[PDB]
Ligand binder design. Structure first.
Ligand code: NAD
Ligand code: NAD
Ligand code: PPY
Ligand code: PPY
Ligand code: K
Ligand code: NA
Ligand code: NA
Lengths: 347, 350
């Protein structure tokens, strides 16, 4: 919206336009209070620049909260590259220039922003960025980075889901129906984990093959148009953000929402409805923090893989703390998580 | 619109919004090719944020060329602070908060951008910025800065005016009529300079005190409504930019345009029109370069005051080169200036 695009209260917005590629670049540094801003690079198509600006600020603010609540010494930032065509349709040469320009932008911030992967960007892209700027996390193991953080994120989301299920009074995942929306790197692993835990998995993905494979594995497909109306115990959004609008919140037929997506909730009203409806939501910025713990933990703190897994597991404990505040103060899980974030950040 | 404002070819745009003060902040880095981007901080009210962005881009682009054509090893950048109220109304606390925020923004650029004064910002403000960030030119003398660059700018503009009048075949300033729009820091000195060289001055300013003072000095006041319709030999815009629109270029009644104002020409056609009508224009980015020569010369290059003075005087020579290319190649002075800028920059890199 105009407000989220222009009247954003974060510390800094960096924009650039490259006529040659037709790509627009946005970097939003929400906060550098706890340290340099850090957050991945999302590359996607947007209807209007306003949307790209809006998303960057929402994602950046989520990163600040995520580092805060996760006890990681970094601020929150995010880059959004507004593509002139579908990612898949971008030619190699064009993509390469795009990354080059993005790296130059990051470089000007001289360490006030550290990037990483996000939607449509990967370790190879991080490496390419690294060919021009030092401020990049998530480079391939071969190039010196921590590599993929997908599994770590999956672990964090899974533990989040277990803690939530337990708090909601459902006991364990065993015998629960979990609807995973998005069978990507993280969602795929999450499904595997929950299935191993005894849950029955309902899955949805825009990629046919992905779905058929899941089915091949014993899972059950859910048509796209049926996703939001399909009864389940847990709804696990692991695709795009903004899924839970007020209307969605009013009609979701589950008892827990716990997934990997960023900015899952469309507005505060949605969050209240869920609460009111007895649907326990595990706040995104808490639940999906595994990625950040992996990259920051490994690359900044020198933590081993085992340690980062351990810390990702502790996301369950953080959520238990979130739930306690929610229950005690009678506020939504999101509010409670913001409160915890502030307390941990020593605000 | 914002969308159109954002379709800018510069290297980087920095923006920020401070809800508490209601101020908007823009930093535009046009180029860092020749060195870190550098340019002043303009603080004013804008109708739309988009206008602030557009202004910043045009100002930043002029800085690129200015440094290049002036042989200064720096890129071009500019800051624009979109005020939530008339600058005068801004209480000291709010102003102080605005500057601190601006300083933080500059600071994140970590030296890829060096600021300085511009409209509504002064050496005191530079000192304040410097409380927070290192990348500031124009600090007070006490603070380690070179202070005001206004006189140096005036000297350069004056020399520019002389060169242009001469090139235009009008001879010397003595006896010529010069219209000085804006009797500010620069305009005031310029008026003094020209008057000393024998010019008859017509003056205008929104500050009535300023006008009276000039009249007291023997100058002739011009009503604001009349400024662009007043016949003169030389038109010296030393207030706001964009004065010379296409429409104004068609009717301007003077032989030379040479002032201190930034981005004097509103649209390209205006430039073409002045050229076609035989009104010799000394490009702003060349003519007003005394400010930059002073700041960069003093604070970066190690130049003495005398040398700075010499360099500013040399603006007339640069203009002579500009007009020379304009005449040979048949292009406008602005185009010839850009050409010269590009030559120098190469040479400067070669
Ligand atoms: O890493 P990571 O795992 O977060 O991301 P990812 O990019 O690896 O996974 C994104 C996934 O979500 C799917 N997706 C996109 N839009 C969808 C929609 N409307 N419904 C369901 N799935 C959709 C994609 O096909 C893909 O599997
Ligand atoms: N590149 C730079 O750093 C830079 C820095 C400062 C000034 N400048 C430029 O040069 C111009 C002169 O700067 P200055 O230091 O002398 O500024 P200044 O504020 O000291 O003086 C500007 C003068 O113009 C007057 N004015 C405003 N609107 C007017 C109008 N419509 N008609 C007549 N007078 C009007 C103001 O009242 C003031 O007396 C600036 O406005 C800007 O374009 C450039
Ligand atoms: O975890 C995320 O959502 C990201 O944005 C990836 C990331 C995390 C931490 C630092 C840099 C990038
Ligand atoms: O005189 C100018 O062009 C300025 O904008 C003031 C300034 C000059 C050089 C560097 C920074 C600011
Ligand atoms: K159960
Ligand atoms: Na703020
Ligand atoms: Na099954």
């Amino acid at each position: 919206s105009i407000d989220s695009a222009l009247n954003w209260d974060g510390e800094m917005t960096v924009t650039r336009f490259d006529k040659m590629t037709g790509a627009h670049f946005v970097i939003r540094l929400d906060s550098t209070q706890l340290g340099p801003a850090a957050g991945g690079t999302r590359a996607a198509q947007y209807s209007q620049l306003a949307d790209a600006l809006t998303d960057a600020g929402k994602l950046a603010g989520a990163m600040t909260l995520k580092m805060a609540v996760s006890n990681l010494p970094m601020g929150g930032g995010k880059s959004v590259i507004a593509l002139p065509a579908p990612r898949h349709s971008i030619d190699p040469s064009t993509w390469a220039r795009i990354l080059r320009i993005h790296a130059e932008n990051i470089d000007k911030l001289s360490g006030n922003y550290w990037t990483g992967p996000d939607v449509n960007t990967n370790s190879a892209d991080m490496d390419t960025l690294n060919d021009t700027t030092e401020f990049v996390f998530g480079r391939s193991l071969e190039r010196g980075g921590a590599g993929s953080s997908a599994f770590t994120t999956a672990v964090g989301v899974f533990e989040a889901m277990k803690a939530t299920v337990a708090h909601r009074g459902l006991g364990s995942l065993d015998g629960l129906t979990v609807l995973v929306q998005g069978l990507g790197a993280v969602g795929g692993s999450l499904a595997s984990l929950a299935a191993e835990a005894g849950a029955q998995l309902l899955v949805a993905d825009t990629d046919t093959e992905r779905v058929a494979h899941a089915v091949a594995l014993g899972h059950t497909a859910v048509a796209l148009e049926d996703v939001l109306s399909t009864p389940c115990d847990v709804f696990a959004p692991c695709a795009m953000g903004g899924v839970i609008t007020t209307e969605v919140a009013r009609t979701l037929d589950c008892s827990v929402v716990a997934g990997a997506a960023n900015n899952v909730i469309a507005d505060e009203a949605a969050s209240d409805i869920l609460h009111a409806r007895g649907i326990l939501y595990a706040p995104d910025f808490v639940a999906n923090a595994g990625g950040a713990i992996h990259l920051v933990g490994r690359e900044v703190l020198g933590w081993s893989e085992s340690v980062v897994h351990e810390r990702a597991v502790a996301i369950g404990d953080t959520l238990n703390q979130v739930f306690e505040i929610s229950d005690n103060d009678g506020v939504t899980p999101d509010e409670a998580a913001r409160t915890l974030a502030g307390r941990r950040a020593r605000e």
